[PDB]
Design brief:
The complex is a heterotrimer of chains A (179), B (190) and C (20). Chain A has 2 domains: 1-79, Class II Histocompatibility Antigen, M Beta Chain, Chain B, domain 1; 80-179, Immunoglobulins (Immunoglobulin-like), CATH 2.60.40. Chain A has 1 helix and 13 strands. By secondary structure, chain A is mainly β. The termini of chain A are far apart. Chain B is α+β, with helices and mostly antiparallel strands. Chain B folds into 2 domains: 1-92, Class II Histocompatibility Antigen, M Beta Chain, Chain B, domain 1; 93-190, Immunoglobulin-like, CATH 2.60.40. In chain B, 15% of the residues lie in helices and 43% in strands. In chain B, the strands form 3 sheets. In chain B, strands 5, 6, 8, 9 and 10 form a 5-stranded antiparallel beta sheet that branches. In chain B, strands 1-2-3-4 form a 4-stranded antiparallel beta sheet. Chain B is elongated. Chain C has no helices and no strands. With 20 residues, chain C is low in regular secondary structure. Classes of the chains: A mainly beta (179), B alpha+beta (190), C little secondary structure (20). Chains A and B meet through β1, β3, α1 and β10 of A and β1, β3, α3, β5 and β6 of B. β1 of chain A pairs antiparallel with β1 (7-18) of chain B. It is classed as immune system. Keywords: MHC class II DR2a, immune system. It forms a trimeric assembly.
């Protein structure tokens, strides 16, 4: 095999959350913002070569919800089994004091696709400049997700990626600090 | 504190390309919670239930000639089309690795020396990182993190080498990646 | 006529009701 493109979509009850994205060899080409009803390209350059009518995604999601309702009853209302995430914290590149860098929180192999991720600097939540990806598909039908935190390396700062998921007995913390 | 049962519906439309678009395989996978229950494989020509839950659907969709014909043309109307549209910035994407060498900032065992060869921001994921003690690949005492995705279409990988600081030695990290015609090399002044 | 290239999405159809 050489390359794989996947149109992955989902609808979740009772949260009523839906997602529509395209995957290319494990990376996201784009997803549709259900709220804003617009396509969001993973890398800005993508949207300069291709387009996608978001309305198409919205229609598919409404259908997925309708289909889920039938499947849920047909299954005799069997709910999904929570599969807790694996969490790893790493830097975009080797750190060096005063050199801008990015902290990456990688949440892997979990389901359902609902997770609460927070960044902590010396114990206090931080949200300035943070960004995240939507839920990415896994061949085993579990999910992956990335959270990012741009930062200026400091030997006095200690960061945590805090992850919450119904499959966890307790919220999880993954530590990282200059060293 | 929300312990209510969740019910998840997933649908994945897969396009697998072999040698350009010479051979293409279209696949529709319907997944309930975590079990794929229904599938349409372009190689089969029709829907087939993978689990009992998809049985009713497989029977219905197959009995829909028009629909069934549309799905049979997906490899062309869907797969090749999109591949054509995205090829330029996906299939052809190439970002050269940034290689840097340095000793681990944390050491256990103090007479040995843990050298780190960091290969950052590359794409595609296919890569070869090797160590050379002057002109002899130290195939031993080498541990790697393996391929790591950053989630932004760039990969990174660190290949550590356990060594013993000896005067006169010149370790070299050699990296081969499709983005470069010749391997990248980085020496470490001991 | 600059021409725009669109990715195409497979359209998912509605599952029929079980009936009765």
């Amino acid at each position: 095999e050489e390359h794989v493109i996947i149109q992955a979509e989902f609808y979740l009850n009772p949260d009523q959350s839906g997602e529509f994205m395209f995957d290319f060899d494990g990376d996201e080409i784009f997803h549709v913002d259900m709220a804003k009803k617009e396509t969001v390209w993973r890398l800005e350059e993508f949207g300069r070569f291709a387009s996608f009518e978001a309305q198409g995604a919205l229609a598919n999601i409404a259908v997925d919800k309708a289909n889920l309702e039938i499947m849920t009853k047909r299954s005799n209302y069997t709910p999904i089994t929570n599969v807790p995430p694996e969490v790893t914290v790493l830097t975009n590149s080797p750190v060096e004091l005063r050199e801008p860098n990015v902290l990456i929180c990688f949440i892997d192999k979990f389901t359902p696709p609902v997770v609460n991720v927070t960044w902590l600097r010396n114990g206090k939540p931080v949200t300035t400049g943070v960004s995240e990806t939507v839920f990415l598909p896994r061949e085993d039908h579990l999910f992956r997700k990335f959270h990012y935190l741009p930062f200026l390396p400091s030997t006095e700062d200690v960061y945590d990626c805090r992850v919450e998921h119904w499959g966890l007995d307790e919220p999880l913390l993954k530590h990282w600090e200059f060293d | 504190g929300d312990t209510r049962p969740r019910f998840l519906q997933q649908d994945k439309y897969e396009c697998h390309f072999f040698n350009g678009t010479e051979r293409v395989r279209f696949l529709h996978r319907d997944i309930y919670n975590q079990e794929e229950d229904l599938r349409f494989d372009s190689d089969v020509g029709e829907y087939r239930a993978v689990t009992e839950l998809g049985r009713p659907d497989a029977e219905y969709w197959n009995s829909q000639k028009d629909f069934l014909e549309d799905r049979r043309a997906a490899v062309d109307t869907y797969c090749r089309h999109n591949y054509g549209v995205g090829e330029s910035f996906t299939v052809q994407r190439r970002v050269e690795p940034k290689v840097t060498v340095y000793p681990a900032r944390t050491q256990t065992l103090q007479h040995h020396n843990l050298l780190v060869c960091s290969v950052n921001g590359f794409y595609p994921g296919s890569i070869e990182v090797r160590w050379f003690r002057n002109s002899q690949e130290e195939k031993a005492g080498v541990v790697s993190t393996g391929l790591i995705q950053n989630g932004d279409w760039t990969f990174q990988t660190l290949v550590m080498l356990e060594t013993v600081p000896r005067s006169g030695e010149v370790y070299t990290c050699q990296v081969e990646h499709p983005s470069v015609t010749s391997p990248l090399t980085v020496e470490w002044r001991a | 006529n600059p021409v725009v290239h669109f990715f195409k999405n497979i359209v998912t159809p509605r599952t029929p009701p079980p009936s009765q």
